[PDB]
């Protein structure tokens with residue numbers, strides 16, 4: 001099972017344009033060369049060229065609906081094709097709104113997959129609950145089957161078909177959830193481990209419980225959508241929405257080390273790295289290097305050591 | 309059950325006068341407005357005006373005995389009256405010597421209460437074991453029934469009646485205990501979770517064990533006396549006696565989140581915040597904002613989210 | 617059982633000469649005076665004068681073989697003599713290559729001892745697997761019986777007799793292991809708790825499992841070889857080989873507190889403190905003071921408190 005890197009220099013899901021530079025910074029930090037040192041064969045598809053939409057007026061409060069909808073449609077097609085060829089897709093983020101296209105294309109080939117979402121946020125607001133209008137905080141709402149028809153058709157997304165049910169996803173790291181989003185996860189009964197649960201259980205028990213919950217019945221493809229702000233700002237300061245009291249460096253690596261050990265990783269998203277948001281040049285280097293270490297961990301690099 | 313904020317701008321229990329500004333900084337950080345966003349009805353009694361004692365010579369080694377004794381007598385009366393009216397009392401600290409008055413007035417209405425003491429110190433020296441003479445490190449000694457008659461009558465405190473027995477209190481966070489204090493907790497058998505126990509058990513098991521220990525037999529009123537130096541100096545740097553290796557931000561919030569969930573919180577003390585002790589202006593803002601987050605957590609704010 | 621401090625100002629096991637100053641900095645921080653405040657009787661043997669070898673050409677890739685071999689032979693004799701007199705030996709580090717002499721002399725008197733190695737590294741490369749040639753990363757290879765005859769005779773070490781078998785040692789804190797070293801620990805089946813295991817289990821369960829593993833059958837002498845880089849660079853920045861994601865201050869103290877409680881500590885090594893490697897003067901003070909706190913903990917100082 002080879003790996004295929006796919007760049008997604010997109011920032012229309014939020015207001016800060018620098019996340020577009022995420023892919024470049026990750027590559028410049030030597031991401032591809034290091035992955036070639038693993039047991040996997042690596043392939044770089046390159047970066048995608050997203051067709052911008054000039055006249056893109058807000059749908060109600062939702063900003064850049066048509067541009068976000070089209071870029072995600074392009075991504076889904078690309079991901080589905082590589083999945084169709086028996087390869088693991090690695091999407092280099094880009095604001096988190098690109099998860100719509102990443103997960104959608106994945107589910108086209110592997111309809112039985114489950115999703116592990118590492119983030120300080122649930123990203124499940126709907127076009128009607130959102131207060132900001134930024135689509136990087138609404139991706140999960142377009143993918144959940146239970147939310148289908150809970151909000152008006154948004155321009156640019158008629159191509160989307162809800163592909164995951166409430167019981168197929170698990171959140172880890174939550175600590176900044178909007179009132180509407182909380183009502184939704186409680187009502188629909190979505191499984192989550194907020195920082196409170198990580199403190200209570202310990203990251204060891206957290207990973208054990210997420211795997212038995214999702215892989216109890218039968219085994220199946222895993223899709224890990226990693227938002228860099230899942231970790232505390234001390235570790236990943238260069239992000240658009242940092243929240244204090246997050247996961248540690250050690251905990252972030254433990255999550256990815258356990259996911260590698262299942263042998264079921266099928267799709268990966270590394271999102272929200274913004275290289276123009278450091279407080280200093282090293283805060284940037286710190287964030288980019290951590291994202292690279294997490295990616296390598298998903299593919300075999302272990303803290304105990306490695307040998308051929 | 310409404311809440312009643314009570315300010316206690318007092319600093320005679322120790323040498324640094326800046327703790328008197330604790331209440332003002334907490335209010336300026338928006339403490340009251342935010343509490344009004346919870347499910348509780350809020351009431352601000354205001355700050356107390358403590359009658360200073362001009363001729364206040366040291367009783368042996370004990371400094372400002374009469375001024376500390378009178379200010380606490382005034383506080384007890386105020387707290388007992390609001391408790392008498394079915395309200396939860398919130399005392400805005402002030403050096404920790406004000407816990408004598410806070411707990412005393414509380415026990416007048418709820419004699420069956422238990423005490424959870426979060427601190428790096430036990431604050432249980434007696435007028436005869438103390439080496440500094442500062443009363444903010446002796447409050448527990450005036451409240452324990454087992455210590456009654458273990459030291460000479462101190463001027464200004466003849467109004468005090470020991471209201472709690474050794475089995476009714478639990479310490480969390482200890483890491484700077486004097487030899488005399490250690491002899492006392494071992495001899496009397498007082499329950500505690502020092503940093504060693506938190507490391508061994510994890511904060512999850514620590515809260516589980518403190519609740520079964522205190523609320524095993526029957527349910528009853530809870531009094532949480534929180535000393536801001538319970539958390540590591542990296543989180544709450546603006547305090548008079550910082551000790552390395554303390555509780556994390558996450559652990560501090562876990563403690564308060566669990567106490568809220570019991571539905572038994574009856575009295576609260578937020579102590580030792582000194583706004584004139586930062587190394588920088590942000591070290592101050594960091595400490596004040598953390599104290600506010602802890603207070604809000606005691607009244608319902610959860611990291612998983614909230615909705616009406 | 618009295619204690620005997622033994623200084624080892626040596627740096628030929630690696631390239632940076634400043635570790636030679638480790639002993640002096642530790643003593644200047646008041647190490648001996650504080651140990652005299654414990655229940656043990658303290659004795660300072662002083663620092664050793666190591667006979668340098670002028671013509672010391674590299675054995676293959678191994679640097680300073682004869683100088684490292686002789687200094688360790690001198691140390692072993694000194695340690696064995698104090699052990700012979702019923703005293704606990706405390707070796708003030710010095711690069712970690714001095715563990716060869718420390719452990720060797722100890723095993724001469726207590727052949728049944730076990731070893732607890734706290735380090736970010738396994739220090740088990742052989743003269744043939746090493747890529748740097750620095751002997752401070754090869755001490756364990758000269759002491760393991762299973763590795764005897766696995767590499768050519770190195771000049772200066774013909775006096776060494778492998779004294780410990782693979783089942784007699786436990787590693788804690790690993791996070792920077794070379795491919796050759798990993799092949800060795802997996803093949804020989806050596807017990808270890810890398811950072812992954814500490815994250816999964818918690819330091820409490822880690823200490824419980826290392827004690828049952830080593831002291832399950834019968835009780836016996838414990839030798840703790842502590843490399844200061846076992847803790848994260850935020851706590852012990854003044855070291856030659858710092859690695860991110862290490863043990864916390866709290867975890868380091870928990871390890872030593874548990875070792876004291878067994879009553880089986882027989883030999884101690886405090887290594888790799890280099891007072892000329894801070895980024896600032898306080899990074900140095902931070903590292904030296906932490907090493908002193910760890911040493912005091914091994915001999916009775918507890919975070920819960922102490923009294924006579």
Ligand SMILES: N[C@@H](CCCC[B-](O)(O)O)C(=O)O
Nearest residue numbers: 096121123125132136137241
């Ligand atoms: N819920 C907030 C924040 C969204 C956070 C988006 B994220 O997790 O992708 O960075 C909003 O909807 O604007």
Ligand SMILES: N[C@@H](CCCC[B-](O)(O)O)C(=O)O
Nearest residue numbers: 404429431433440444445549
């Ligand atoms: N035990 C020391 C320190 C007291 C700490 C007081 B506290 O916890 O209220 O800040 C003393 O009695 O002087």
Ligand SMILES: N[C@@H](CCCC[B-](O)(O)O)C(=O)O
Nearest residue numbers: 712737739741748752753857
């Ligand atoms: N394995 C690397 C690093 C050795 C680390 C040595 B130590 O743990 O004593 O600081 C080397 O052999 O050069």
Ligand SMILES: [Mn+2]
Nearest residue numbers: 120121227229
């Ligand atoms: Mn986020």
Ligand SMILES: [Mn+2]
Nearest residue numbers: 096119123227
């Ligand atoms: Mn996100």
Ligand SMILES: [Mn+2]
Nearest residue numbers: 428429535537
């Ligand atoms: Mn205190």
Ligand SMILES: [Mn+2]
Nearest residue numbers: 404427431535
């Ligand atoms: Mn206190």
Ligand SMILES: [Mn+2]
Nearest residue numbers: 736737843845
């Ligand atoms: Mn090391």
Ligand SMILES: [Mn+2]
Nearest residue numbers: 712735739843
């Ligand atoms: Mn070492």
